[PDB]
Amino acid sequence: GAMGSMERASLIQKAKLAEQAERYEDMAAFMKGAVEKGEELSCEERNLLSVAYKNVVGGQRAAWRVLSSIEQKSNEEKGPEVREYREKVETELQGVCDTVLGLLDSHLIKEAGDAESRVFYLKMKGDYYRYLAEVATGDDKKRIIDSARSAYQEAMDISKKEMPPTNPIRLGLALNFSVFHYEIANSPEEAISLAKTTFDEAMADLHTLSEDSYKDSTLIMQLLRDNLTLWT
């Protein structure tokens, strides 16, 4: 608890300042601090946690892909440096994924009783196991993929019972599970069927929304469409 001595409200305030400053490592440390106070997170606070770690692992994943690509070219028809540096980046990425999954397990998920909070955290759990799956190569890979699938499936079952088809969390979950199917599970047809069904069911529910909800739903539906255009 590096943030153990700071007020919860001060950690949340500083997480917002870090977002404005694009200091995403600081933002993640502040939001880890806030979570470790042991209170549940509001909608906005869950978004701060998700934004902060998304951006930290986003930069690690982009770095890993650059290095892994240089490493693969070195192994076509040199020393250990490229492998060693890819491993260093990969190890730091796995640590950030382990930290997020740790917060979800201790104790965000078990205290999340509302559909919007529970689905949000289960989606995150799927996402961080998916990032681990992206770099996994040993004995653990099958179990990592199944941990992602299981978290996403539990989130999907709740979202389908409890949320309208245009709910941005439900739409964001479905988008991410479809990327899981395409990129990780080697199931491009499942990816394409989930993205299509998700898009079509949201389309048929747009008439119920305010101009502001409409704009949040259609932004994510456009990412389903961009993926389907790429995949078909």
């Binding site: 998700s50 951006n55 739409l171 979950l173």
Partner: peptide, 11 residues
């Protein structure tokens, strides 16, 4: 392009 996944913030 690359595969699009959801933004960190959804609403």
């Amino acid at each position: 392009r690359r595969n699009a996944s959801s933004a960190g913030r959804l609403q």
